[PDB]
Swiss-Prot record, chain B:
Organism: Severe acute respiratory syndrome coronavirus 2 (2019-nCoV)
The protein's assembly and partners: Binds to host ACE2. RBD also interacts with the N-linked glycan on 'Asn-90' of ACE2. Cleavage of S generates a polybasic C-terminal sequence on S1 that binds to host Neuropilin-1 (NRP1) and Neuropilin-2 (NRP2) receptors. Interacts with host integrin alpha-5/beta-1 (ITGA5:ITGB1) and with ACE2 in complex with integrin alpha-5/beta-1 (ITGA5:ITGB1). May interact via cytoplasmic c-terminus with M protein. May interact (via N-terminus) with host bilirubin and biliverdin, thereby preventing antibody binding to the SARS-CoV-2 spike NTD via an allosteric mechanism.
Result after altering residue 22 to I: In strain: Omicron/XBB.1.5, Omicron/EG.5.1
Source domain of life: Viruses
Function of the protein: Attaches the virion to the cell membrane by interacting with host receptor, initiating the infection. The major receptor is host ACE2. When S2/S2' has been cleaved, binding to the receptor triggers direct fusion at the cell membrane. When S2/S2' has not been cleaved, binding to the receptor results in internalization of the virus by endocytosis using host TFRC and GRM2 and leading to fusion of the virion membrane with the host endosomal membrane. Alternatively, may use NRP1/NRP2 and integrin as entry receptors.
Consequence the record notes for mutating residue 30 to A: In strain: Omicron/BA.2, Omicron/BA.2.12.1, Omicron/BA.4, Omicron/BA.5, Omicron/BQ.1.1, Omicron/XBB.1.5, Omicron/EG.5.1
Protein name per the record: Spike protein S1
Amino acid sequence: SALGKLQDVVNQNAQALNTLVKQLSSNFGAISSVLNDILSRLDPP
Amino acid sequence: FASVYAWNRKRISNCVADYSVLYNSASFSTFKCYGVSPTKLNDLCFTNV
C-alpha cells in the first residue's frame, strides 16, 4: 500500500484485441472499407 | 460544345438528380459508369456534381 507480471498479461491481451478491432477499417485494396458502401453502389458481378 | 483542350465544366448542386430520365432513355452510344452502377444512382446522395 510490484504486480507488473500480472499487468503484462492484461496489457498484451488488450493490445491484441485492439489490433483485431482496428483492422476492420483497412481496404486491403478495395474501394471502401465498409461493406454496405460496396453493396449500395455496386451490382453483384 | 467546347473543344477537347478547353472543355467546359458545369457544377451541379442543390437538386434531386433523376437519372431515371437518363437511364431508361435509349438515345446515347456509350453509358459507362466506374465505381457505381447506373441503376443505383437514385438511391445515393452526392456532395457535388
